[PDB]
């Protein structure tokens, strides 16, 4: 048995490498490095923070105050929020408008404050990739990001620019182009409690910036498709996911190194695993992330998977195969064009062309026990991760959001044992990158806010 001989010889090999618990167990170099550890400074940014907010089953779920404030902007795309240590929120749309909200009036719907709308006036007079230093967006703003301190919001989209606006007036303070032709930005994330931005640009590139210095730190390379989502916490690590290469990478940005995590679910072995006694299959494209803590994260796929990954395992720890359902099959009055229902039913091939909803938004509350998933099934899902950190489980649903969920994130309130949050979710009737979405089933372009309690 050749793989048995491989495992056996590898075991003998590791035993021989060990060859080349007592009462005294102290090692001189380890305790010397621990003396240097006692000598050093800056136990602030580099907390390898584990899950210290265990509250998944604690708070209420089923009776949230859900207000779906519809807004008149075609296809809202992103949502950025802010809390100091009054709270503002930000939305941005495919109609080239950024909009500031106040959200701190917690028991009611948010309040519009200020527009900032680019348009055809901001097309540059050059068509030349480094004099892209205009003051507004002329194409398809895809992402906003508020500063952790709140001086600025920074936004960008398919016009390959980063425009950083002031908070108090929504004015463009600085323009930083991405200096090449395909340099469309797709996701932005500040590292927490900082002034450092991580943008993920479709050149298979990740750009980093210091916003209050108007400088770019480091460009870091290495995905294989467009870097569709990004996520960061207080550590200088980052977690990006490229779309169709089906890998999620995490980046030690000062070292400029990474850990890659591929997928790897196969319907052959999965249907055999069920065949030991079923509509589930392989993977299209890993789409969204959120780093839950500094040892784990969660990925949202294109076949409706939500997966939970550790920092110490290439293959994922936990899967959840169907997370928002399978799409309604196309009707017999809109598949075939024959006359009889028998042939128009034969043109469905049974179950072979039922496609699942793909999770287009995922948000893990940082270091907490609970994350929120959203797609165009109409109902957001709330999941909590078990305390042994090897599984998660569906708590409840938030069914007042008709449309695609282009963004989810939460806003905190309450103290250490009694808490209430408003879950913002940007709702559109069209995916945040291309159109591709038919059967617009009662959708509206709005902000689904929910107020969850206890």
């Amino acid at each position: 048995n050749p793989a048995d001989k491989r495992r056996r010889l590898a075991k003998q090999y590791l035993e021989n490498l060990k060859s080349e618990d007592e009462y005294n167990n102290f090692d001189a170099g380890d305790l010397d490095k621990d003396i240097i550890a006692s000598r050093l400074k800056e136990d602030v940014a580099e907390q390898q923070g584990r899950v210290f907010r265990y509250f998944g089953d604690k708070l209420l779920i089923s009776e949230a105050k859900q207000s779906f404030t519809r807004v008149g902007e075609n296809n809202l795309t992103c949502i950025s929020c802010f809390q100091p240590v009054r709270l503002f929120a930000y939305t941005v749309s495919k109609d080239l408008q950024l909009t500031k909200y106040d959200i701190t009036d917690f028991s009611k719907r948010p309040k519009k404050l200020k527009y900032a709308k680019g348009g055809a006036k901001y097309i540059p007079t050059s068509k030349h990739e480094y004099e892209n230093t205009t003051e507004g967006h002329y194409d398809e703003i895809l992402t906003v990001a508020a500063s952790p301190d709140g001086k600025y919001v920074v936004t960008g989209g398919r016009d390959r620019k980063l425009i950083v606006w002031s908070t108090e007036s929504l004015s463009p303070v600085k323009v930083i182009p991405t200096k090449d032709r395909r340099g469309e930005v797709l996701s932005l994330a500040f590292r927490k409690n900082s002034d450092q931005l991580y943008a993920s640009c479709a050149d298979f590139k990740i750009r980093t910036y210091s916003i209050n210095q108007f400088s770019q730190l480091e460009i870091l390379y290495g995905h294989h498709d467009i870097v569709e989502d990004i996520s960061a916490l207080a550590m200088e690590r980052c977690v990006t996911v490229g779309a169709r290469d089906r890998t999620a990478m995490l980046w030690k940005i000062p070292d400029e190194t990474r850990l890659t995590f591929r997928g790897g679910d196969e319907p052959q072995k999965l249907l055999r695993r069920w065949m030991k006694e079923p509509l589930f299959f392989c993977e299209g494209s890993i789409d969204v992330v959120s780093m839950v803590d500094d040892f784990h994260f969660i990925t949202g796929s294109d076949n409706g998977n939500i997966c939970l990954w550790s920092l110490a395992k290439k293959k994922p720890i936990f899967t959840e195969r169907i997370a928002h359902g399978i799409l309604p099959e196309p009707s017999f009055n809109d598949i075939s064009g024959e006359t009889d229902e028998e042939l128009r039913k034969r043109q469905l091939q049974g179950k072979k062309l039922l496609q699942p909803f793909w999770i287009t938004s995922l948000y893990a509350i940082p270091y907490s026990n609970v994350f929120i998933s959203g797609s165009w099934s109409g109902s957001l899902k709330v999941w909590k991760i078990s305390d042994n950190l090897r599984s998660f489980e569906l708590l409840g649903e938030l069914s007042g959001a008709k449309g695609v969920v282009t963004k989810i994130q939460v806003v905190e309130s309450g103290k250490h044992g009694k808490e209430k949050f408003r879950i913002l979710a940007s709702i559109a009737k069209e995916h945040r990158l291309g159109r591709w979405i038919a059967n617009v089933s009662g959708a509206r372009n709005g902000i689904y806010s929910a107020v969850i309690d206890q």
Partner: protein, 229 residues
């Protein structure tokens, strides 16, 4: 050109620092330059470790002793004034100098193996140790290889640990150098391989010499604190 005990990285230089003469031997000590500069790294080069030696931060065995190649051997408590650094350095299990950090009431003393008791001149009993502290007047029952406890403010013996069957012993020398556990066996031969034998995690057995072993306390209660992992 280095020994094994110093935990000295090879990418350092060409000439290795010979320790000067002092209390301990050359083969069982580390100087202050290899202590401060390239082990716990309070310096970067010989110039600035000489600078802090001229500033006189070091207080090994309660005296200053400003010297670069001063041979700190076994359990000389290195004392540094800034950030109240108290360091008792002992042997680890694989031959190096593990420098444990201790506190002030433990660095207020040390212990020492007695080597010989003499009727030297004028009726004065007499005792020496590995740093050579010729202190006056112990009890008559000081055999060889017992353990005195030095005062470190004056020089007097304060406590005494008798060497017998059933004592916690430290081995510094030969192929057992730096082991603790002190009980499987006792065997005093008549000129070599004579010792008390030391256990392991599975309570294995070991052979050493008398002079290459010296007592540190009792079965569970040494008043020295020890590092762990």
């Amino acid at each position: 050109a280095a020994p094994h005990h110093w935990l000295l990285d090879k990418l350092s230089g060409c000439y290795a620092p010979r320790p000067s003469a002092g209390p301990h031997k050359l083969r069982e000590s580390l100087p202050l330059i290899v202590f401060l500069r390239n082990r716990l790294k309070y310096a970067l080069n010989g110039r600035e470790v000489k600078a802090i030696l001229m500033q006189r931060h070091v207080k090994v065995d309660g005296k200053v002793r400003t010297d670069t190649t001063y041979p700190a051997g076994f359990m000389d408590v290195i004392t540094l004034d800034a950030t109240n650094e108290n360091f008792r350095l002992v042997y680890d299990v694989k031959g190096r100098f593990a420098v444990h950090r201790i506190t002030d009431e433990e660095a207020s003393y040390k212990l020492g193996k007695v080597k010989k008791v003499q009727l030297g001149k004028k009726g004065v009993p007499y005792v020496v140790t590995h740093d050579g502290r010729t202190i006056r007047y112990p009890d008559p029952n000081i055999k060889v290889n017992d353990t005195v406890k030095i005062d470190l403010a004056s020089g007097k013996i304060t406590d005494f640990i008798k060497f017998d069957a059933g004592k916690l012993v430290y081995v510094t020398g030969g192929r057992n150098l730096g082991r603790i556990g002190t009980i499987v066996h006792k065997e005093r031969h008549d000129g070599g391989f004579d010792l008390v034998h030391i256990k392991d995690s599975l309570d294995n057995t070991f052979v050493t010499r008398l002079n290459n072993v010296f007592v540190i306390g009792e079965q569970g209660k040494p008043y020295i604190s020890l590092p762990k992992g």
